[PDB]
């Protein structure tokens, strides 16, 4: 196919624009042209309303066509390494270029994908916000996958994936998680119907876990190097032993009546909306404490590093001495005897009765 | 004292106004005058900024002087039957006229009151929003008392009060409630530190109970004619047998995993922010259902009378058939397969993902 | 008709209940019975889901049947003086008992009413939240009418009504208001399409005006004894001379670049969301000042009576000295140099940057 | 200095930790060690509470020490090219390494900086959220500067800066802007006290302008290739001719009574909280329309590409036909005759009366 055949095919499609429709085909024909004419690497046709695309420049490596109205894709160069067509109306994808490394098709209406484990170089897959009832088996080169907000009832098996690092499977219908891979670094699976978590204690690189909004009564022993744990809105009464590496913990909307000693490097603690009665001493590394909406009548001595204190909706008659770097103080709706002495660092303040 | 002595005393006080201060003493001197001159029943000096009052017209029956800046009151006619001085800066009250029937002194800085049980005609007492550490014994003529938002650690004994009908003691520090009077109709005691409620089952007129935001793990058997129960934000797993008269129930922010059959006249049910998994059938009299922020994946068949459905933040894939008079539909943030068919009655709608 | 015929007619209707439907006809048959049996004045059938009513007890004076599902009403006793059927599905009303004094039919689907000016004792009419495209002429005995939230394009003529005291005609499509009656005390007509107000200066009892959310560029001279004026969200640049009786003024969401001297008894001033640059001195009676979201860089000296200061979203580098009774301070999002010294009265505080 | 001298100096400082204080000096001594031991490029000591730093490894190029508590910095290697010490308590900076390219010191308490125009390789300067009353002259290599939220009354002269691309000077006290450089691509200066903008029409690369929340009555002729304009909350009645390249326009909170034809590629239009009466036809490329809180009674025909329609708080009796890809519909509080027919694309809906 010659330059002139491309150019001409592109002027045909541009005149094919649904007349009123708002499609910026001229703008699109200019980008194809310069792209063919500059023999660029990547073609950017984002947000031009296209309800379709013409034949693409051969040898392109990356197609950026998101935020259009595609229901179908044209044939793609076999040189293609990156496909970014999020925010379209695709209802299915066909098999893909064989060198694809990056698949982005989130915010589409996908109901099924091709056989992903045949694409030997897919590193990153994003099919967030589609209508997938199930996931195909995944290729072993996969490094990252986001499949949140679909309608998944099960996930593929994951433990054999040699390079999987992160999974987003939140907002689905999983009742169970598969055994996880040793390389996994993070798992985000909030809002599923997990009645339990798989075994975690043997995962030496798992650093982040989100399992908020599920059905947990209990947690397994944690990965020894866990750093951030979010299990907000579950039915937990107790926690397993917490790794000394933990630095972010969200236990809000559970059913704790107290918390025993937290690990000593914790920076952020969100334990709001529990039934907590008492706090004993806090880690001195703690910078943010949110215990809003609990049943406290006294707070423990405040960590010297604290910069954020959210203790709204409790029964406190008084705030303990505040740290010289407090930046945010929110202690609205407590039966407060007196105004604590506000440090000069405080730049955001709320107080009430 | 003559008209002229009154008039003159009132012009002295009016010239005594702190100069800039914004006090509307002229306005006040006109009301005293016409009041003396019309020999009115009641004197209205509300919201004129007075930092004080002069001698009052003799024989008045009611003084309305709220929303001023009084720290002290003048001597009051012994004819006085009603004293409304809410929203002032009083830090104590002296003994009162002996015919007082109505005492209103809420939104002041009271730290102690006189010996109330000596005032034989006090029917209604309001000392909400003061700084009372304790309540005096109450007169047996008391019909109503509101002492919410003080710093009460205990309440007077109440069971001997022959006409007590309603108590507001919410937002205090009660760890315990006294045995309640047989005549009591309503008790409002949210936000105290109740570890338990007194015996209720023998109270044949108790119709309303608010004990939200306390420390209850369990409830006593209820008054057989209970109509409204609010126990939001406690630690309840189960309820006692619910009276068939119950028509308003708030169990939000407790720890229910389900609810068995509700009484058949219930009109309003707020069970949001629990851990509910399933609902079996609902009372057909139900007009409002709030089960927001639970763990539902299916709703039960909807009552024909329902006009308000708040089912935001759950896992529903679909809304069941809606009743022909639904007026409000809020089902935002559910993994909703499809839009339910909205009845023409619906005037307030929210839907999302 | 005998007791037994009533009783029996009522048991027929009760068995006629749509089977599942949730209708509390038994409850309704008990109230009719005791009502007939006690020969009560008023019959209360509120909120029982009735989709209809049987024949009513003769000689009743008041019917309370609101919050049901009526599309039609039964014949009413000619003794009827009060009809409260708000919150039903009526799509029309027939002519009414001739002694009716109180008509309440708000929250229904009325598209037309009978000839109201023939009912010689109608004092109060409420047909708020219906679908009335026009109002019938009104009877001269009318004292109050609320016809807000209908679809009125015009109002009846009002100036001849000898006792009209208050009108709610807000949320309609009026492009114009009729000349108003001398007795009128209040007019609420927010959210219409008023391009102008009628002449007001000759109304000696008008005390309250709501005309927020219309199309005013200008206001007529005001009633000399005006006390509350709300003209929020119009296109005003200037105000007419303001009566010294004015005590509530809402000029928020207009286009003022400043305000000259306010009357000296003003208690509340809401001038938020204007383009105000400067405030000169304030009335010393002022208790609430809301000037949020303006273009201020300095506030004027604060009135001694002020209890509420809302000055959020401005450019202030500092708050002036606060009055010893300030109760509420909201001065969030101002480029604040320093924290003002908070008086011990302040019970609600917000500060930020 | 030898490895051992470093190591030892670092153990001295670590033992110097204020005892309780929460400072993670051990963690810091490990990073210095491995950094010296790996002879890394960059040293990362973020968020360890340090109230100080020991001597740094020589030849480092980048220091990341933000989110500590420094009031002072140690001497820095002259090899230093990047200094990231945001979120500390520095009250002044000394002269910097001479090869510095990146200066990050936002969220500190700076009151004055050294003589910036002597640092010949500073490309990026961020001193957002400090207390600078004035800016020093800038070096000609500057590419980006953010000095928002300080207390600047004037800016340095900018027009001579050969490579300046972007300026953030929002939230200051500027009454005037300097003439701008030909290379400038974006200017963010919301919330200052601009009474006017400099000449813009000769700026061929200016693409973005934020001047929301100032005092503009009028705008200069715009840069011919302008793409995004935000002038929310000013006093504009009219706009200059708008470039056909404009694609983002925010005129919310101004005083427009209408808008004539918008440029044909506009994607987003926020004209909420004006006084708009009518809209004539819209650009067919428009994807977001926000005209909330205006005075509309009819909308114009809706663009085929629209995905977001925010038309809350108007007087509409009906919504026109909705586009097949509408994703968001918010038309709450309009006197809506009927529910429009919702397209299957709509995933976020609000409707009300
Ligand atoms: Ca709780
Ligand atoms: Ca609570
Ligand atoms: Ca829960
Ligand atoms: Ca939840
Ligand atoms: Ca403004
Ligand atoms: Ca503003
Ligand atoms: Ca407006
Ligand atoms: Ca408005
Ligand atoms: Hg190309
Ligand atoms: Hg898009
Ligand atoms: Hg995009
Ligand atoms: Hg307490
Ligand atoms: Hg409390
Ligand atoms: Hg301290
Ligand atoms: Hg907060
Ligand atoms: Hg009197
Ligand atoms: Hg007041
Ligand atoms: Hg009051
Ligand atoms: Hg589900
Ligand atoms: Hg979900
Ligand atoms: Hg039905
Ligand atoms: Hg809601
Ligand atoms: Hg009766
Ligand atoms: Hg109702
Ligand atoms: Hg009602
Ligand atoms: Hg300023
Ligand atoms: Hg500002
Ligand atoms: Hg003062
Ligand atoms: Hg506020
Ligand atoms: Hg190093
Ligand atoms: Hg920090
Ligand atoms: Hg940071
Ligand atoms: Hg309208
Ligand atoms: Hg309206
Ligand atoms: Hg269409
Ligand atoms: Hg909205």
Alpha-carbon distance of D44 to D60, in angstroms, equals 11
DSSP states of B65-109: --SS--SS-----TT--EEE--SS--SB-----TT--EEE--SS-
Spatial separation of the C-alpha atoms in residues A251 and A245, rounded to whole Å: 17
How far is C-alpha C87 from the geometric centre of its chain's CA atoms? 17
Task: Answer whether C6's CB lies under 8 Å from C29's CB.
Answer: no
Element containing residue B36 per DSSP (H, E): helix B25-38
How many domains does one find in chain D?
1
* Chain-chain contact of C349 with A348 (C-beta, under 8 angstroms): no
Within 8 A of D257 by CB-CB distance, chain C residues are: 235
D contact chains, 3+ CB pairs < 8 A: A, B, C
Please give the angle made by the CA atoms of B24, B84 and B7, to the nearest 5 degrees: 45
Q: Rounded to whole angstroms, how far apart are CA atoms A132 and A107?
A: 12
And the tokens for A314? 């409790």
B-proximal residues of D, 243-302, CB under 8 Å: none
Q: DSSP 3-state assignment of A328?
A: strand
C-alpha to C-alpha distance for B84 and B47, rounded to whole angstroms? 12
C213 marked as binding residue:
yes
What is the SS3 assignment for B6? helix
- Count the Cβ atoms, other than its own, within 10 Å of residue B9: 15
The residue with tokens 């100032």 is D214
Q: Are residues B123 and B146 in contact, defined by beta-carbon separation less than 8 angstroms? A: no
> How close D230 gets to chain B, by Cα (Å)?
29
Closest chain D C-alpha to B300 CA, distance in angstroms: 24
Determine contact, residues D352/B349, Cβ cutoff 8 Å.
yes
Alpha-carbon distance of B125 to D54, in angstroms, equals 67
| Residues in a beta bridge with A260 | none
Interatomic CA distance for residues A93 and A78, integer angstroms: 15
| Residues in contact with C55: Cβ distance below 8 Å, sequence separation at least 6, in sequence order | C1, C6, C9, C74, C75
Cβ atoms of B326 and B309 within 8 Å: the answer is: yes
Rounded to whole angstroms, the Cα distance separating A330 from A308 reads 8
d(CA A194, CA A212): 10
> With b meaning 16 or more CB within 10 Å and e meaning fewer, what string describes A16-34?
ebeeebbbbbebbbebbbe
Q: What values do phi and psi take at C269, rounded to 5?
A: -135, 120
- Smallest-distance ligand from the CA of C60: 23
Q: Are the C-beta atoms of B51 and B72 separated by less than 8 Å?
A: no
Euclidean distance between CA atoms C115 and C111, whole angstroms: 13
Token representation of residue C320: 């002036």
Cα torsion D271, D276, D277, D278 to 10°: value is -30
Backbone angles phi, psi at B29, to 5 degrees: -70, -30
Helix orientation angle between D3-15 and D25-38, rounded to the nearest 10 degrees: 170
- Tell me the structure's resolution in angstroms, rounded to a single decimal: 2.3
- In three-state secondary structure terms, B350 is strand
Give strand pairing partners of B84.
B64, B104
Determine the Cα–Cα distance for residues C181 and C18; give it in Å rounded to an integer: 49
**Can you tell me whether residue C62 is helix, strand or coil?**
strand
Ligand nearest to the CA of B296: 19
Are B310 and B272 contacting, i.e. CB atoms less than 8 angstroms apart? yes
Answer for the pair C287, C269: CB distance below 8 angstroms, yes or no.
no
Are A351 and C348 a contacting pair, CB within 8 Å? yes
Q: What are the backbone dihedrals phi and psi of residue D188, each rounded to the nearest 5 degrees, phi first?
A: -110, 105
C294 is in an annotated binding site: no
Instruction: Give the separation between CA A246 and CA B26, rounded to whole angstroms.
Output: 68
- Sign of the four-CA dihedral A42, A46, A48, A51: positive
Q: Using alpha carbons, select from A52, A57, A69 the residue that is nearest to residue A14.
A: A52
Q: How is residue C128 written in tokens?
A: 């708020």
Residue-wise DSSP of B175-212 = S-PPPPPTT--EEE--SS--S-----TT-TT--EEE--
Residue of C nearest to B48 (CA): C285
Using the mean position of ligand 2's atoms as its centre, give its distance from the Cα of residue A273 in Å. Answer: 7
Q: How many angstroms separate the CA atoms of A113 and A133, rounded? A: 10
Nearest alpha-carbon partner for B265 in B250, B254, B279, B249: B249
- Residue D92 has what DSSP assignment? B
Does an H or E element contain A26, and which?
Answer: helix A25-38
**Residues on chain D touching C172 (C-beta within 8 angstroms):** 335
The span from the CA of B201 to the CA of B198, in Å, is 9
Do A264 and A283 touch, CB atoms closer than 8 A? yes
Residue with tokens 């927001």: B292
Pairing of strands D186-188, C348-351: unpaired
d(CA A342, CA B153): 28
DSSP-derived 3-state class of residue D112: strand
3-state secondary structure of D304: coil
Q: Which residues make Cβ contacts (< 8 Å) with residue C5, sequence separation at least 6? A: none
Contacts 24+ apart (CB under 8 A), C146-154: C146/C106, C147/C172, C148/C172, C148/C188, C149/D335, C149/D353, C151/D317, C151/D335
Phi, psi of D116 (to 5 degrees): -55, -35
First-residue to last-residue Cα distance in chain C: 76
| B257 chain-A contacts, CB cut-off 8 A | 235
Interchain contact D182–B (C-beta under 8 A): no
What's the half-sphere exposure (Cβ side, CA atoms, 13 Å) at D43?
Answer: 32
Are A352 and C349 within 8 A, CB to CB? Answer: yes
Classify burial at A322, counting beta carbons within 10 Å of its beta carbon; exposed 0-12, middle 13-18, buried 19 or more: middle
- Neighbours of C (≥3 Cβ pairs closer than 8 A)? A, B, D
**Rounded-to-integer distance, Cα B211 and Cα B190, Å:** 4
Those residues with Cβ within 8 angstroms of residue B5's Cβ, 6 or more apart along the chain or in another chain: none
On whether any CB of chain D is under 8 Å from the CB of A333, the answer is no
Distance from CA of D336 to the nearest CA of C (A): 10
How many helices and strands in chain C, by DSSP H and E? 2, 18
Provide CB contacts within 8 A for D37, sequence distance 6+: D3
How far B284 CA sits from the closest chain C CA (Å)? 5
SS (H, E, C) C137-157: CCCCCCCEEECCCCCCCCCCC
- Give the closest residue to A35 by CA, choosing from A6, A70, A78, A72: A6
Token pair 């338990």 is at which residue? Answer: B196
Contact B291, B273 (CB under 8 A): no
Task: Give A93-128 as a DSSP string.
Answer: -----TT--EEE--SS--SB---GGG-TT--EEE--
Q: How, if at all, do strands B348-351 and D348-351 pair?
A: antiparallel
> φ and ψ at C270, to 5 degrees?
-115, 105
User: How many angstroms separate the Cα of B207 from the Cα of each of A278, A326, B196, B204?
Assistant: 34, 47, 19, 8
Inform me whether the C-beta atom of residue C202 falls under 8 Å from chain B C-beta atoms.
no
Count of CB atoms situated within 10 Å of the CB of B321: 10
Count Cβ–Cβ pairs < 8 Å, chain B vs chain D.
24
Domain range holding C284? 1-353
Largest Cα separation within chain B, whole Å, is 83
Give the C-alpha separation, D195 to D173, whole Å: 11
Known binding residue B87? Answer is no
CA atoms within 13 A on the CB side of D341: 5
Q: Are C191 and C169 in contact (CB under 8 A)?
A: no
The answer to whether D240 and D220 have CB atoms below 8 angstroms apart is: yes
Cα–Cα distance between D82 and D103 in angstroms, integer? 6
* Chain C environment of B284 (Cβ under 8 Å): 20-22
Question: How far apart are alpha carbons A230 and A219 in whole angstroms?
Answer: 12
Nearest by Cα to A270 from A300, A290, A247, A299: A290
In which region does residue C121 sit, left (phi positive, over 0), alpha (psi from -120 to 50) or beta (all else)?
alpha
Chain C nearest-CA distance from D39, in A, is: 41
Interface residue A139 vs chain D (CB under 8 A): no
Indicate yes or no: CB of D255 within 8 angstroms of CB of C257. no
Candidates A216, A221, A217; CA nearest to A199 is A221
Beta bridge partners, D349, equal: B351, D329
CATH of the domain at C287: 3.80.10.10
Could you tell me which residues come within 8 angstroms of residue B271 by beta carbon, excluding any fewer than 6 positions away?
A: B249, B251, B252, B256, B259, B290, B291, B294
Nearest residue in chain A measured CA to CA from D23: A285
CA-based nearest residue in chain A for residue B150: A335
Closest by Cα among D157, D150, A315 to C317: D150
Rounded CA-CA distance D227/D247 in Å is 5
Would you call C295 and D215 a contact, using CB atoms and an 8 Å cutoff?
A: yes
CB pair distance less than 8 Å for D352 and B353: no
Distances (CA, A) of B308 to C213, D91, D324: 29, 57, 30
- The CA C267 to ligand 29 mean position distance, Å, reads 18
Measured CA to CA, the distance from residue D58 to residue D79 in angstroms comes to 8
Instruction: Please give the full DSSP string across C42-54, using - where no structure is assigned.
Output: EEE-TTS--S---
Instruction: Write the residues followed by a gap in chain A (C–N more than 2.5 A).
Output: none
Q: Nearest CB to C348: which of A346, A348, A352? A: A352
Type and span of the H or E element at D328: strand D328-331
Judge residue B49's burial from the number of C-beta atoms within 10 Å of its C-beta, 0-12 exposed, 13-18 middle, 19 or more buried: buried
The single-letter DSSP state of residue C23 is -
Q: How many helices (H) and strands (E) does chain B have?
A: 2, 18
How far apart CA A299 and CA A331 sit, in angstroms, is 12
Q: What are the DSSP E strand ranges found in chain B? A: 42-44, 62-64, 82-84, 102-104, 124-126, 144-146, 166-168, 186-188, 208-210, 228-230, 248-250, 258-259, 268-270, 278-279, 288-290, 308-310, 328-331, 348-351
- Euclidean distance between CA atoms A215 and D51, whole angstroms: 43
For D299, residues 6+ apart whose C-beta sits below 8 A from its C-beta are D279, D291, D311, D316, D319, D320
Rounded to a whole number of angstroms, the distance from the CA of A200 to the nearest CA of chain B is 24
B95 C-beta neighbours (distance < 10 Å), count: 13
């Amino acid at each position: 196919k010659s330059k002139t055949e491309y150019y001409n095919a592109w002027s045909e499609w541009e005149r094919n624009a649904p007349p009123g429709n708002g499609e910026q085909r001229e703008m699109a024909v200019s980008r194809l042209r310069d792209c063919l004419d500059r023999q660029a690497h990547e073609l950017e046709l984002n947000n031009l309303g296209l309800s379709s695309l013409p034949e693409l420049p051969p040898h392109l490596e990356s197609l950026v066509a998101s935020c259009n109205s595609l229901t179908e894709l044209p044939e793609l160069p076999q040189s293609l390494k990156s496909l970014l067509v999020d925010n379209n109306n695709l209802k299915a994808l066909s098999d893909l270029p064989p060198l694809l490394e990056y698949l982005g098709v989130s915010n589409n209406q996908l109901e099924k994908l091709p056989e992903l484990q045949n694409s030997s170089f897919l590193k990153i897959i994003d099919v967030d916000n589609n209508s997938l009832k199930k996931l195909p088996d995944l290729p072993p080169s996969l490094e990252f996958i986001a499949a949140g907000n679909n309608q998944l009832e099960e996930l593929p098996e994951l433990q054999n994936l040699p390079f999987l690092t992160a999974i987003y499977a939140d907002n689905n219908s999983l009742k169970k998680l598969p055994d996880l891979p040793l390389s996994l670094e993070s798992i985000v699976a909030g809002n599923n119907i997990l009645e339990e978590l798989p075994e975690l204690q043997n995962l030496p690189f798992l650093t982040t876990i989100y399992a908020d909004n599920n059905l947990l009564k209990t947690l397994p022993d944690l990965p020894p190097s866990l750093e951030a744990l979010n299990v907000r809105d579950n039915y937990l009464t107790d926690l397993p032993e917490l790794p000394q590496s933990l630095t972010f913990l969200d236990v809000s909307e559970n059913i704790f009546s107290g918390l025993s000693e937290l690990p000593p490097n914790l920076y952020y603690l969100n334990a709001s909306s529990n039934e907590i009665r008492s706090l004993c001493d806090l880690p001195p590394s703690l910078e943010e404490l949110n215990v809003s909406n609990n049943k406290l009548i006294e707070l423990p001595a405040l960590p010297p590093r604290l910069e954020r204190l959210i203790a709204s909706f409790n029964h406190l008659a008084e705030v303990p001495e505040l740290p010289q770097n407090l930046k945010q103080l929110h202690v609205e709706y407590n039966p407060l005897r007196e105004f604590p002495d506000i440090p000069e660092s405080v730049e955001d303040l709320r107080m009430n009765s």
